[PDB]
Amino acid sequence: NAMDSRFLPATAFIDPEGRNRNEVERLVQQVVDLILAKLTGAAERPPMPETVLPGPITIPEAAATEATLLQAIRDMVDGSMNPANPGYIGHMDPMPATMAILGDLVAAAVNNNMLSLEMSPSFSRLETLLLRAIAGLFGLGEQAGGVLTSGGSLANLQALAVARNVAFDSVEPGITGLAQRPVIFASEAAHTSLQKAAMLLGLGTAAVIPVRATADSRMDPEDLRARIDQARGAGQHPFCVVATAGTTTTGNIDPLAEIGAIAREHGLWFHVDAAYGGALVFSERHRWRLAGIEQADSITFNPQKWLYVAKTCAMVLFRDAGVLERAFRIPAFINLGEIGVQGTRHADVVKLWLTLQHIGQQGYARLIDDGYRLAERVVEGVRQRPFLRLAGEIDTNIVCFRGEPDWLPAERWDDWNAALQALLLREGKIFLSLPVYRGGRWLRAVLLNPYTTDAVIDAMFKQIDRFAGR
């Protein structure tokens, strides 16, 4: 009735008996052609878009023309960041695997819902089985399981929610009746989704007690021990320790076995935030760096980062999946909505499973090796240059470094590194990020793009030398 009417475009929906197949096929092909053109041509667009500024938006009364829509897609693509450019080396945001793109097409077309088994009969079972398999690569044991979540922040929130619920039995009565303030410990280098989660969970941001990190940005276990004693002495109630496997700024890995041993000694939930570094489970050569992770009560891991799955794709894993029934699920197989922060949720398992199959464990082991190799080339270039300083030793394919030119007052180093970052981008078409770290602005390389080469790295250093020598 609506679709026959003059108030809907003939291609607004796909007629399920094929009546508008030809019109629908031509519209789809125009969008597919445009996208393939932009992506097979991605190196023609710089890593960051040229500056334009947009006016107030209006939602039209009448249907837009296919022309207007295609032009909108064109402008949206041209105005977006372009991590497919070999020069894009700044963030844990990679070009997507081909199958990941196609898996989201497939997911959106069937439009199933992870909320319940009846709404995702194929997908729910697959996600549950795949995450058991992944939990097994982490060595979490037979009872281990998890859920997919829209982002690592939600995975951290859910881990901390469970750790809180187990410590305080807070599912039904909440935590406002408490005389001792609950607190958690994390490296001073750990992700701010811990503070955001602590605020959301009613613990407040201050409940995340920072633990000293070494010169190489790894948590100091002796300091963790100190801070736990201090918390107890102050009448606080520690309930969780978060170790990070791949810190956001520097990509370093905490000493997971030692941290875990301290958490267990003190009866604290041990959560490992392996959002980035968890991908090392696919590399024989580098997997040892995660040693201790197998004793975690929970793990956060984001395939959208180092496994090249188009955003979002992240999970939280529990060593005992049964805990979600005990200390999460509200009073009322298992409909996944009941045991996640989200209810309705897009079927990320489609792009995850298709991606994992097409690249394979050996494929990831090779991508990971090549990331390390580029990273080590950056480290060597920094070592050859007295005016550059490394943040510290690297644990992953991330290198944080900055200029500390001795001919400049330190008060002007932030300006110097900001200027270098802008120049690398403008003239070298190379994007580094510029995080705040240790109270200063540092440059940050994340060597993820499979098409970044040694030549790009040598090119960056050449322009750095030219900038340094004015």
Q: Which of residues 382-441 bind a copy of itself (CB under 8 A)?
A: 418, 421, 433-435, 441
234 is a site residue for a copy of itself (CB under 8 A): no
| 102: partner contacted, choices a copy of itself, K ion, none (Cβ within 5-8 A by kind) | a copy of itself
**Cα first-last separation, the chain:** 70
Task: Decide if residue 280 touches a copy of itself (CB under 8 A).
Answer: no
Continuous segment of H or E residues that includes residue 162: helix 152-168
Binding residue for a copy of itself, selected from 141, 148, 152, 283, defined by CB under 8 A = 152
Does 317 participate in binding a copy of itself (rule CB under 8 A)?
no
Q: Which of 111, 112, 52, 48 is nearest to 83 (CA)?
A: 48
Given the complex with a copy of itself, which of 262 and 355 has the nearer CB atom? 355
Select from K ion, a copy of itself, none the partner in contact with residue 261, using the beta carbon and a kind-dependent cut-off of 5 to 8 Å. none
Closest residue to K ion, based on beta-carbon distance: 388
Judged on CB neighbours under 10 Å (0-12, 13-18, 19+), 469 is exposed
Using DSSP's 3-state secondary structure scheme, residue 219 falls into strand
Among the residue ranges 65-73, 253-261, 376-384, 391-399, the one whose residues contact a copy of itself (CB under 8 A): 65-73
Nearer to K ion, 370 or 404 (CB): 404
Give the SS3 label for residue 86: coil
Sole binder of a copy of itself in the list 293, 310, 324, 382 (CB under 8 A): 310
- Binding partner at 251 among K ion, a copy of itself, none, C-beta below 5 to 8 Å by kind: none
Cα(154)–Cα(424) distance, rounded to whole angstroms?
34
381 in Cβ contact with 400 (< 8 Å): no
d(CA 353, CA 278): 17
Q: Which of a copy of itself, K ion, none lies near 388, with the C-beta cut-off 5 to 8 A by kind?
A: K ion
Report the C-alpha gap between 424 and 429 in whole angstroms. Answer: 6
Task: Find the shortest distance in angstroms from Cβ 120 to a copy of itself.
Answer: 7
Least distance to a copy of itself, CB of residue 378, Å: 15
Q: How far is CA 316 from CA 104, 152, 159, 274, 331, in A?
A: 21, 8, 7, 10, 22
Q: Which is nearer to a copy of itself, 112 or 295 (CB)?
A: 112
Based on CB atoms, which residue is closest to K ion, 228 or 388? 388
Structural element, H or E, at residue 264: helix 256-265
Q: Any contact of residue 98 with a copy of itself (CB under 8 A)?
A: yes
Give alpha helix (H) positions in 311-402: 323-327, 348-383
Q: Which of residues 194-233 bind a copy of itself (CB under 8 A)?
A: 195-196, 198-207
Interface with a copy of itself by CB under 8 A: which range of 211-219, 257-265, 286-294, 301-309?
301-309
- Beta carbon nearer to a copy of itself, 41 or 322: 41
Question: Does the protein bind a copy of itself through residue 274 (CB under 8 A)?
Answer: no
d(CA 380, CA 396): 15
